[PDB]
Amino acid sequence: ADSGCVVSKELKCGSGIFITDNVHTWTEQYKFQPESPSKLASAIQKAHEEGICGIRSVTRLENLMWKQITPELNHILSENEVKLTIMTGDIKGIMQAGKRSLRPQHNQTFLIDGPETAECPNTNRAWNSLEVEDYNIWLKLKEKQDVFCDSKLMSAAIKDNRAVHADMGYWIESALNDTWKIEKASFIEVKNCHWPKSHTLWSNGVLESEMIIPKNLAGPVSQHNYRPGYHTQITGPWHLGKLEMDFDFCDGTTVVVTEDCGNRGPSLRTTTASGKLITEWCCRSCTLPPLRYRGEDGCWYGMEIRPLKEKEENLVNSL
Amino acid sequence: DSGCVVSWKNKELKCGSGIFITDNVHTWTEQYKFQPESPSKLASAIQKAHEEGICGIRSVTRLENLMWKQITPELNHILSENEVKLTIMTGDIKGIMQAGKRSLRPQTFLIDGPETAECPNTNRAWNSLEVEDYGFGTTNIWLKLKEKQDVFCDSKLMSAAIKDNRAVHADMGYWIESALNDTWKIEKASFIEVKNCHWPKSHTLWSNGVLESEMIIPKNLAGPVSQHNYRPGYHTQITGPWHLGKLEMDFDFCDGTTVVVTEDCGNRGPSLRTTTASGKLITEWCCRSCTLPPLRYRGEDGCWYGMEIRPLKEKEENLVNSL
Ligand SMILES: *[C@@H]1O[C@H](CO)[C@@H](O)[C@H](O)[C@H]1NC(C)=O
Ligand SMILES: *[C@@H]1O[C@H](CO)[C@@H](O)[C@H](O)[C@H]1NC(C)=O
């Protein structure tokens, strides 16, 4: 067990389990490391032999690993005198999943991450094929090609009417004010894996048509992932990659509830592409305070929120 | 909520923000104490309930009973001073804290104590108190009356967490550890109390597709409805030694006993103790489909085995079981 001391203005000490937030920390405390870059390289040789253009990362740290290891891998690949050039790209927005998966055991090109292409489909990319051995993190090959995120990375906790589902890239908070409902969400990444129900709190009788964070977007199948007058934000501003969902009004905007408002569609931003600000918003059934997203390009509103009088075409949505 | 914690086994410590769950069970000091909001209102509720025709009430948890014992004379004092002739009497608690079919809402009176015929549990009040706020310091806690009736344990006392493939469901008298060795399963369970409420789903992990026949710790014993409450080859231990009240159950053999897996072994029945009423020690045990290390209960009178586990040779009627 983990024995120590923590302070909230109350002080408490003892033994138990401590769940940390590594998302909001400006410092990068964790890095990913391989146990056998040789085995990895061989698995990539096999993958290319098994017909694979490249691989797509599940998380940000995996991508950073692929980046920091690519030269050595290519070097190793050259050390084995096997003709292949490994190319690692960047991650942006939702990390799309790959249907292929690695198996443990002029020049060609192996495309790790990067943007989409016609030469290499997502179905030819490998994904979710690296798990954690132990803790800098000793990683390794997986059992099989499950569409779940790594269990050793997931975490969760609940006490004093505050529930948290946490990850190395996610930080999801719900609370009990009259009822249990989602409160906050923090994202460094957006991934296409599924949140394991082993590390999930309150998973019984969960309507997937109501869970805000999408299941196929590592959304916890939980009644904590619930918010009255909301549904799954399938078409939300997840194209940001890094964002902060909360339940308040965007700065300088006003949202009201009315039947006169339109139907739910792709999330929109307060700021026009031209820079024009809209202050008047509406929802047909949403529950004030409204679902908002804080990111790079500014604030966005939930799918349920549409502008009152302004035409939707004038705005920017999830493309 | 920021702080620093150190793991000896992991040989690693960490600082930062987040959420800390504390094992209130293996605390050397009884840090917590139950205290009401307005004892006068409690007394009022007692008078009203007695007038309704109630005979007594039953605590839900240990520290609740402690509060009752800590405020009874003051309560009985309030009664007389506020014009009424009711004698409130509180006995101790042993084993399972039987629920009461009735409840509180905002000739003598009996609280807890032994089971009696004058005041059956069907006419007892139970699960009528909830916490509003926490005191600080010893650490005390407020209590007020519930506006709703249920058999759920107070949500504000339960906790849960998962990290490093080790789940924990905690309480003030419960501490239930699960882990991932090969597969996910329950590893330990610590009790200072045995209650009959229900462990709510809001504070539960993996509550999907949970066979109550597979949940080791019974649902009606505040057992977490979870696949963290599972064990390969074991079922709901309804006839475990829950008469002990305080116990520490886990998975290892009893000291100087032998358990094996044999289809010839007897079927599952009441949990037996390794030692008989005379004092003999049953060294040979078995199970049909159970898995080793065996489900054992470390209590006061010694080590016990799971329901699936039977004495290999010795007639089970020569052994002591949960009556
Ligand atoms: C809790 O919800 C009520 C309405 O349901 C609201 O009036 C109150 O402000 C909320 N408490 C908060 C936000 O702390
Ligand atoms: C997991 O189970 C195996 C089965 O024999 C055992 O050898 C091992 O020690 C167990 N691991 C832990 C951490 O208890």
XYZ file of C-alpha atoms and ligand atoms in Angstrom:
670
model
C 0.000 0.000 0.000
C 0.910 3.670 -0.305
C 1.441 5.364 3.045
C 1.852 9.119 3.288
C 0.389 12.549 3.953
C -1.929 14.797 1.939
C -3.499 18.237 2.487
C -6.608 19.697 0.832
C -8.200 23.304 4.589
C -7.953 19.847 6.142
C -4.887 17.673 6.753
C -4.882 13.855 6.591
C -2.355 11.015 6.786
C -2.280 7.248 6.613
C -2.058 4.274 4.298
C -4.109 3.646 1.173
C -4.071 4.508 -2.524
C -3.187 7.897 -4.044
C -4.489 8.952 -7.467
C -2.431 11.727 -9.080
C -3.283 14.256 -11.791
C -0.455 14.191 -14.326
C -2.396 16.119 -16.949
C -2.456 19.597 -15.405
C 1.203 19.435 -14.380
C 3.224 21.721 -16.671
C 6.113 19.312 -16.168
C 6.369 16.024 -18.050
C 6.947 13.476 -15.285
C 6.570 10.336 -17.408
C 8.283 9.003 -20.531
C 7.859 5.753 -22.475
C 10.696 3.230 -22.914
C 11.059 -0.072 -24.835
C 12.638 -3.242 -23.426
C 13.810 -4.515 -26.787
C 14.114 -2.059 -29.693
C 15.500 -5.095 -31.514
C 12.334 -7.158 -30.995
C 10.348 -4.081 -31.932
C 12.327 -3.618 -35.129
C 11.856 -7.299 -35.961
C 8.136 -6.911 -35.360
C 8.113 -4.010 -37.804
C 10.008 -6.121 -40.349
C 7.331 -8.752 -39.839
C 4.571 -6.144 -40.113
C 5.929 -4.830 -43.406
C 6.296 -8.476 -44.423
C 2.699 -8.946 -43.267
C 1.773 -5.954 -45.430
C 1.777 -2.866 -43.231
C 2.451 0.709 -44.364
C 3.001 2.045 -40.862
C 1.606 2.296 -37.345
C -0.586 4.757 -35.466
C -0.053 5.665 -31.826
C -2.739 5.194 -29.187
C -1.465 7.924 -26.892
C 0.743 11.017 -27.070
C 3.568 9.449 -25.077
C 3.671 6.496 -27.464
C 4.118 8.940 -30.329
C 6.901 10.714 -28.437
C 8.547 7.334 -27.934
C 8.337 6.444 -31.621
C 9.900 9.801 -32.377
C 12.743 9.474 -29.865
C 13.454 5.893 -30.950
C 13.008 6.061 -34.741
C 16.680 6.818 -35.491
C 17.868 3.927 -33.338
C 15.242 1.688 -34.918
C 16.270 2.692 -38.428
C 19.845 2.321 -37.272
C 19.059 -1.129 -35.893
C 17.070 -1.890 -39.041
C 20.201 -0.898 -40.941
C 22.308 -2.908 -38.482
C 20.294 -5.921 -39.576
C 20.865 -4.722 -43.140
C 17.144 -4.916 -43.872
C 15.997 -2.442 -46.517
C 13.414 -0.175 -44.857
C 13.062 3.510 -43.959
C 11.061 4.339 -40.824
C 9.224 7.661 -40.870
C 7.420 9.009 -37.812
C 4.810 11.737 -38.115
C 3.059 14.046 -35.668
C -0.260 13.608 -33.888
C -3.141 16.081 -34.241
C -6.727 15.861 -33.005
C -8.221 12.416 -32.469
C -5.742 9.575 -32.798
C -7.443 7.331 -35.337
C -7.227 3.591 -34.689
C -5.615 0.969 -36.909
C -7.211 -2.358 -37.749
C -3.908 -4.171 -38.152
C -1.760 -4.968 -35.132
C 1.870 -5.919 -34.499
C 2.807 -9.541 -33.759
C 5.631 -10.409 -31.326
C 8.355 -12.814 -32.483
C 13.907 2.880 -53.999
C 13.940 2.114 -50.275
C 10.710 1.118 -48.557
C 8.912 3.429 -46.154
C 7.269 2.767 -42.782
C 4.927 5.594 -41.813
C 4.471 5.980 -38.058
C 1.680 8.452 -37.280
C 1.517 11.656 -39.297
C -1.519 12.688 -41.355
C -3.777 10.489 -43.480
C -2.882 9.317 -46.996
C -4.149 7.233 -49.913
C -0.948 5.172 -50.054
C -1.607 3.967 -46.508
C -5.134 3.501 -45.113
C -5.898 3.429 -41.389
C -6.867 -0.219 -41.804
C -3.274 -0.987 -42.789
C -1.898 0.782 -39.731
C -1.125 -1.058 -36.503
C -2.591 0.285 -33.267
C -2.997 -0.658 -29.594
C -0.297 -3.300 -29.825
C 1.967 -2.077 -27.022
C 1.255 -2.614 -23.319
C 3.017 -1.752 -20.054
C 5.402 -4.202 -18.407
C 6.239 -2.030 -15.407
C 7.478 1.306 -14.068
C 10.136 6.016 -17.303
C 7.928 3.092 -18.297
C 8.966 -0.412 -19.353
C 6.587 -1.203 -22.228
C 6.078 -4.423 -24.216
C 4.020 -6.284 -26.837
C 0.373 -7.114 -26.133
C -1.685 -10.278 -25.774
C -4.011 -9.588 -28.717
C -5.616 -6.784 -30.752
C -8.266 -5.567 -28.322
C -9.724 -2.113 -28.902
C -9.265 -1.250 -25.232
C -6.756 1.228 -23.826
C -3.950 -0.091 -21.603
C -5.231 -1.103 -18.158
C -1.971 -0.291 -16.365
C -2.350 3.329 -17.482
C -5.988 3.810 -16.488
C -6.956 4.944 -12.992
C -10.056 5.953 -11.052
C -11.160 7.146 -7.618
C -14.163 8.341 -5.618
C -14.510 9.910 -2.153
C -16.432 12.760 -0.494
C -18.889 12.982 -3.419
C -16.240 13.528 -6.100
C -15.590 10.923 -8.781
C -12.585 10.935 -11.092
C -11.647 8.807 -14.069
C -8.013 9.478 -14.899
C -5.376 8.620 -17.453
C -2.008 9.924 -18.616
C -3.848 12.143 -21.072
C -7.351 12.366 -19.658
C -8.756 13.840 -16.476
C -12.496 13.392 -16.055
C -14.377 14.677 -13.024
C -17.942 14.286 -11.832
C -19.536 15.317 -8.539
C -22.695 15.125 -6.435
C -24.711 18.329 -6.497
C -28.287 17.073 -6.056
C -27.268 14.232 -8.391
C -24.149 12.592 -9.857
C -23.137 14.288 -13.093
C -19.974 15.037 -15.051
C -18.286 18.311 -14.105
C -14.917 18.712 -15.789
C -12.715 17.112 -18.427
C -9.073 17.643 -19.352
C -7.403 16.406 -22.520
C -3.804 16.342 -23.764
C -4.786 13.756 -26.334
C -7.844 12.187 -27.903
C -7.664 8.447 -28.519
C -9.843 5.922 -30.308
C -9.520 3.085 -27.799
C -12.141 1.931 -25.314
C -12.081 2.625 -21.598
C -11.910 -0.749 -19.813
C -14.831 -1.506 -17.498
C -12.459 -2.947 -14.909
C -11.205 0.582 -14.264
C -14.691 2.071 -14.587
C -16.910 3.388 -11.787
C -20.674 2.816 -11.855
C -20.923 0.948 -15.174
C -24.309 -0.699 -14.625
C -27.194 0.358 -16.847
C -25.310 3.036 -18.736
C -27.060 4.502 -21.779
C -24.389 5.058 -24.426
C -26.783 7.564 -25.982
C -26.274 9.750 -22.916
C -22.579 9.489 -22.084
C -20.953 12.784 -23.034
C -17.468 11.494 -23.792
C -17.912 9.017 -26.685
C -17.192 5.328 -26.031
C -15.154 5.017 -29.219
C -13.263 8.041 -27.880
C -12.125 6.371 -24.641
C -15.260 7.631 -22.933
C -15.970 5.898 -19.623
C -19.152 3.842 -19.837
C -20.417 5.457 -16.644
C -23.374 7.336 -15.189
C -20.701 9.747 -14.049
C -20.163 10.526 -17.728
C -23.726 11.809 -17.622
C -25.133 15.303 -17.805
C -28.868 16.141 -17.791
C -30.067 17.588 -21.083
C -27.083 16.234 -22.996
C -26.034 13.325 -25.180
C -22.803 11.967 -26.625
C -20.627 14.699 -28.122
C -19.708 12.635 -31.177
C -19.292 15.829 -33.186
C -17.501 17.939 -30.598
C -14.275 19.954 -30.921
C -12.079 16.908 -30.372
C -10.090 18.004 -33.415
C -8.154 20.215 -31.019
C -6.299 17.286 -29.489
C -5.811 19.302 -26.312
C -8.864 20.895 -24.659
C -10.701 21.540 -21.396
C -14.397 20.711 -21.126
C -16.394 22.368 -18.362
C -19.905 23.551 -17.565
C -20.092 27.329 -17.662
C -20.743 30.114 -20.160
C -18.059 30.987 -22.675
C -16.595 34.409 -21.940
C -18.847 37.160 -23.267
C -21.622 34.814 -24.375
C -25.184 34.193 -23.216
C -27.109 30.922 -23.580
C -30.836 30.493 -22.955
C -33.215 27.544 -23.164
C -35.983 27.706 -25.762
C -38.081 25.547 -28.066
C -37.455 28.176 -30.743
C -33.830 27.049 -30.919
C -32.770 24.581 -33.607
C -31.725 20.944 -33.277
C -28.400 19.531 -32.037
C -25.536 19.585 -34.538
C -21.727 19.893 -34.783
C -20.196 22.003 -32.014
C -19.661 25.646 -32.886
C -17.240 28.291 -31.649
C -18.036 31.730 -30.247
C -15.470 33.390 -32.495
C -16.250 33.487 -36.210
C -13.515 32.602 -38.700
C -13.598 36.326 -39.470
C -13.275 37.066 -35.761
C -16.864 38.147 -35.150
C -18.253 37.306 -31.714
C -21.710 35.886 -31.081
C -23.212 36.567 -27.668
C -26.692 35.113 -28.069
C -27.086 31.341 -27.921
C -29.886 28.857 -27.270
C -30.580 25.197 -26.609
C -33.820 23.273 -26.928
C -33.403 21.062 -23.865
C -29.855 21.547 -22.516
C -29.214 22.115 -18.808
C -27.700 25.474 -17.865
C -24.880 26.048 -17.087
C -23.966 24.995 -20.644
C -21.385 22.496 -21.870
C -18.370 24.431 -23.083
C -14.933 23.546 -24.407
C -11.858 25.697 -23.830
C -9.035 25.173 -26.309
C -6.603 26.756 -28.756
C -8.904 28.663 -31.105
C -11.012 29.754 -28.136
C -14.307 28.628 -26.623
C -16.813 26.212 -28.187
C -20.304 25.125 -27.145
C -21.883 21.688 -26.888
C -23.749 20.089 -29.779
C -27.020 21.031 -28.097
C -26.137 24.714 -28.275
C -26.877 26.699 -31.421
C -26.817 30.452 -32.044
C -30.121 32.232 -31.399
C -30.438 34.495 -34.441
C -27.142 34.064 -36.291
C -26.993 31.614 -39.193
C -24.999 28.455 -38.493
C -23.130 28.685 -41.805
C -21.486 31.882 -40.604
C -19.692 29.894 -37.902
C -17.016 27.224 -37.719
C -17.860 23.667 -36.683
C -16.302 20.210 -36.467
C -14.994 19.548 -39.970
C -5.862 18.233 -2.791
C -2.068 18.107 -3.039
C 0.437 15.969 -1.163
C 3.206 13.384 -1.214
C 2.991 9.620 -0.659
C 5.664 6.888 -0.525
C 5.432 3.253 -1.625
C 7.879 0.958 0.160
C 7.360 -2.106 -2.029
C 7.467 -0.057 -5.227
C 10.413 1.759 -3.649
C 8.992 4.940 -5.134
C 7.344 8.113 -3.852
C 5.283 10.754 -5.655
C 3.962 14.284 -5.111
C 1.169 16.290 -6.686
C -2.585 16.797 -6.905
C -5.368 14.224 -7.091
C -7.356 12.019 -4.701
C -6.203 9.998 -1.668
C -8.134 7.080 -0.193
C -7.181 6.206 3.396
C -7.462 2.767 4.978
C -9.579 3.659 8.005
C -9.668 -0.004 9.000
C -6.016 -0.627 9.816
C -5.784 2.670 11.661
C -4.160 2.223 15.075
C -6.174 5.175 16.352
C -9.943 5.529 16.093
C -9.692 8.832 14.226
C -13.391 9.166 13.495
C -16.414 9.951 15.671
C -20.121 10.308 14.869
C -21.956 13.392 16.149
C -25.494 14.595 15.359
C -26.607 18.019 14.161
C -29.368 18.565 16.694
C -29.800 15.843 19.364
C -33.117 17.475 20.248
C -34.412 16.717 16.751
C -33.218 13.138 17.169
C -35.173 12.867 20.413
C -38.210 14.358 18.682
C -37.920 11.713 15.975
C -37.699 9.037 18.669
C -40.868 10.287 20.374
C -42.743 10.483 17.071
C -41.577 7.009 16.038
C -42.502 5.436 19.377
C -45.907 7.114 19.108
C -46.181 5.533 15.661
C -45.708 2.221 17.445
C -42.014 1.486 17.008
C -40.161 -0.609 19.601
C -36.526 0.156 18.844
C -33.856 0.966 16.268
C -30.736 -0.725 14.927
C -27.451 0.965 14.059
C -26.146 0.570 10.516
C -22.466 0.939 11.316
C -20.066 0.670 14.285
C -19.330 4.351 14.942
C -23.073 5.007 14.735
C -23.633 2.638 17.642
C -20.725 4.403 19.345
C -22.518 7.728 18.885
C -25.706 6.276 20.337
C -23.722 5.069 23.352
C -22.037 8.481 23.604
C -25.248 10.527 23.557
C -27.852 8.207 25.129
C -27.745 9.672 28.643
C -27.989 13.173 27.166
C -30.855 11.974 24.985
C -32.745 10.336 27.845
C -32.080 13.549 29.756
C -33.588 15.651 26.961
C -36.685 13.435 26.916
C -37.593 13.926 30.574
C -36.810 17.653 30.461
C -38.958 18.028 27.350
C -41.992 16.352 28.915
C -42.153 12.657 28.037
C -41.840 9.345 29.890
C -39.661 7.183 27.630
C -36.711 5.057 28.754
C -34.070 4.726 26.048
C -31.776 1.728 26.456
C -28.821 0.793 24.242
C -27.092 -2.580 24.194
C -23.888 -3.591 22.445
C -23.335 -4.943 18.932
C -22.033 -8.395 17.971
C -21.832 -10.015 14.533
C -24.133 -8.808 11.756
C -26.000 -5.559 12.379
C -29.479 -6.720 11.362
C -31.461 -4.183 9.388
C -34.729 -2.782 10.661
C -37.767 -2.704 8.398
C -38.862 0.688 9.724
C -37.092 4.041 9.830
C -36.883 7.532 11.330
C -38.340 10.749 9.915
C -37.871 14.434 10.868
C -42.679 1.713 28.188
C -38.976 1.684 27.302
C -36.950 2.077 24.095
C -34.241 -0.322 22.929
C -31.275 0.435 20.658
C -29.221 -2.401 19.162
C -28.373 -5.007 21.777
C -29.361 -8.674 21.512
C -32.231 -9.936 19.389
C -35.426 -9.943 21.424
C -39.046 -10.990 21.017
C -40.442 -7.848 22.637
C -38.872 -5.743 19.898
C -38.390 -7.708 16.662
C -36.203 -6.354 13.851
C -39.319 -6.015 11.691
C -40.405 -3.201 14.014
C -36.951 -1.617 14.217
C -35.596 1.544 12.604
C -32.444 1.409 10.510
C -30.598 3.398 7.835
C -32.206 6.703 8.755
C -29.082 8.764 9.319
C -26.778 10.512 6.868
C -23.757 12.803 7.211
C -23.969 16.477 6.297
C -20.499 17.783 7.122
C -17.142 16.709 8.524
C -15.480 17.865 11.719
C -11.706 18.213 11.923
C -8.763 17.808 14.293
C -9.692 13.157 16.398
C -12.043 13.799 13.487
C -15.785 14.106 14.050
C -18.674 14.146 11.560
C -22.129 15.711 11.413
C -25.252 13.600 11.092
C -28.775 14.563 10.036
C -31.967 12.663 9.205
C -32.656 11.201 5.763
C -35.640 12.379 3.731
C -35.696 9.085 1.850
C -35.717 5.442 2.947
C -33.486 2.746 1.463
C -31.185 -0.147 2.287
C -28.189 1.623 0.772
C -25.249 2.458 3.021
C -24.491 6.191 3.275
C -22.724 7.237 0.073
C -20.649 9.809 1.941
C -18.665 7.174 3.863
C -17.760 4.861 0.998
C -14.714 5.194 -1.248
C -13.035 3.329 -4.112
C -9.946 3.488 -6.317
C -7.867 1.637 -8.911
C -4.166 2.074 -9.647
C -1.306 -0.228 -10.661
C -3.834 -3.008 -11.330
C -4.917 -3.023 -7.683
C -8.516 -2.074 -6.917
C -9.819 -1.122 -3.482
C -13.325 -0.605 -2.164
C -13.131 1.185 1.185
C -15.443 2.224 4.006
C -15.123 2.959 7.719
C -15.392 -0.715 8.610
C -14.684 -2.291 5.233
C -11.494 -2.569 3.215
C -11.662 -4.745 0.116
C -8.586 -5.323 -2.053
C -8.559 -6.747 -5.563
C -5.722 -7.117 -8.061
C -4.563 -8.453 -11.425
C -2.586 -11.635 -10.932
C -3.102 -13.469 -14.219
C -6.702 -12.272 -14.013
C -8.640 -9.736 -11.968
C -9.959 -11.143 -8.701
C -10.565 -10.274 -5.062
C -7.454 -10.565 -2.895
C -8.268 -9.344 0.620
C -11.179 -8.202 2.779
C -10.933 -6.464 6.147
C -13.831 -5.879 8.520
C -14.252 -4.192 11.887
C -17.982 -4.489 11.358
C -20.542 -6.540 9.436
C -23.527 -4.506 8.204
C -26.645 -5.477 6.273
C -27.051 -2.389 4.073
C -26.346 -2.334 0.335
C -23.156 -1.020 -1.230
C -24.310 1.665 -3.707
C -23.404 1.485 -7.404
C -22.135 5.057 -7.645
C -19.130 4.101 -5.571
C -18.590 0.741 -7.252
C -16.083 -0.434 -9.880
C -16.970 -2.817 -12.716
C -20.650 -3.087 -11.773
C -21.574 -4.519 -15.171
C -22.749 -8.109 -15.521
C -22.353 -8.987 -11.885
C -23.763 -12.364 -10.838
C -24.884 -12.091 -7.212
C -24.170 -15.813 -7.051
C -20.572 -15.014 -7.979
C -20.131 -12.020 -5.679
C -18.197 -13.502 -2.777
C -19.278 -10.866 -0.281
C -23.113 -11.087 -0.256
C -25.123 -8.191 -1.660
C -27.165 -7.881 1.529
C -23.923 -7.636 3.496
C -22.938 -4.344 1.845
C -20.882 -6.425 -0.573
C -19.710 -4.500 -3.654
C -21.649 -5.577 -6.722
C -18.564 -6.065 -8.856
C -16.319 -8.421 -10.778
C -13.734 -7.213 -8.300
C -15.830 -9.210 -5.826
C -15.206 -12.391 -7.826
C -12.977 -15.422 -7.368
C -12.435 -18.357 -9.759
C -14.305 -21.349 -8.358
C -16.091 -19.511 -5.558
C -19.591 -18.203 -4.935
C -21.443 -15.882 -2.585
C -20.297 -16.826 0.912
C -23.715 -16.357 2.531
C -22.863 -18.926 5.192
C -19.413 -17.581 5.994
C -18.399 -16.737 9.568
C -20.096 -13.339 9.486
C -21.101 -13.928 13.107
C -17.611 -12.830 14.105
C -18.305 -9.146 13.466
C -14.633 -8.309 13.118
C -12.529 -10.428 10.761
C -9.796 -10.508 8.137
C -10.462 -12.797 5.174
C -7.999 -13.654 2.404
C -6.545 -16.452 0.295
C -4.012 -18.772 1.948
C -4.170 -22.031 3.892
C -4.942 -22.069 7.595
C -1.880 -22.603 9.781
C -0.985 -26.283 9.508
C -3.830 -27.382 7.256
C -3.972 -28.983 3.824
C -6.527 -28.206 1.129
C -6.766 -29.878 -2.271
C -9.060 -29.951 -5.289
C -11.106 -33.145 -5.405
C -14.413 -33.867 -7.138
C -14.989 -36.480 -4.423
C -15.024 -33.784 -1.721
C -18.317 -32.715 -0.150
C -20.470 -29.977 -1.660
C -20.472 -26.387 -0.394
C -22.056 -25.818 3.013
C -21.715 -23.564 6.089
C -18.200 -22.283 6.689
C -16.291 -24.481 9.113
C -13.516 -23.630 11.550
C -10.234 -25.547 11.580
C -10.657 -26.232 15.316
C -13.586 -28.092 16.917
C -15.430 -27.457 20.186
C -13.057 -29.908 21.855
C -9.976 -28.329 20.308
C -8.900 -30.828 17.650
C -7.336 -29.446 14.449
C -8.620 -30.609 11.059
C -5.465 -30.906 8.941
C -7.074 -32.440 5.854
C -9.411 -30.322 3.719
C -10.692 -30.277 0.144
C -12.959 -28.696 -2.448
C -14.714 -29.820 -5.623
C -13.986 -26.859 -7.878
C -12.448 -24.227 -5.597
C -9.057 -22.731 -6.453
C -5.901 -22.597 -4.326
C -4.839 -20.737 -2.179
C -8.095 -21.451 -0.325
C -10.590 -18.855 0.870
C -9.743 -18.469 4.564
C -11.148 -16.340 7.368
C -8.809 -15.089 10.093
C -10.978 -14.197 13.077
C -11.001 -14.349 16.872
C -11.480 -18.073 17.451
C -8.968 -18.863 14.706
C -8.858 -19.734 11.019
C -11.887 -20.702 8.919
C -12.356 -21.930 5.360
C -14.732 -21.110 2.517
C -18.161 -22.663 2.020
C -16.781 -24.822 -0.782
C -14.122 -26.253 1.524
C -14.895 -29.387 3.503
C -12.935 -31.621 5.867
C -11.385 -34.348 3.738
C -12.145 -37.240 6.078
C -13.512 -36.007 9.407
C -17.308 -35.897 9.554
C -18.358 -32.265 9.227
C -20.826 -32.671 12.098
C -17.847 -33.007 14.403
C -16.837 -29.487 13.348
C -18.003 -26.014 14.346
C -19.917 -23.936 11.801
C -21.860 -20.697 11.519
C -25.112 -21.242 13.426
C -26.608 22.446 -7.385
O -27.761 22.413 -8.238
C -28.738 23.420 -7.937
C -29.915 23.172 -8.852
O -30.065 21.789 -9.144
C -28.120 24.803 -8.125
O -29.078 25.802 -7.789
C -26.881 24.939 -7.247
O -26.244 26.189 -7.488
C -25.906 23.799 -7.530
N -24.753 23.881 -6.643
C -23.537 24.245 -7.058
C -23.407 24.575 -8.517
O -22.582 24.305 -6.291
C 0.175 -14.972 -8.800
O -0.225 -16.340 -8.809
C 0.868 -17.256 -8.980
C 0.265 -18.641 -9.055
O 1.142 -19.613 -8.502
C 1.862 -17.103 -7.831
O 2.983 -17.950 -8.060
C 2.322 -15.657 -7.725
O 3.150 -15.486 -6.579
C 1.121 -14.718 -7.634
N 1.553 -13.336 -7.600
C 1.338 -12.530 -6.554
C 1.862 -11.133 -6.683
O 0.745 -12.915 -5.548
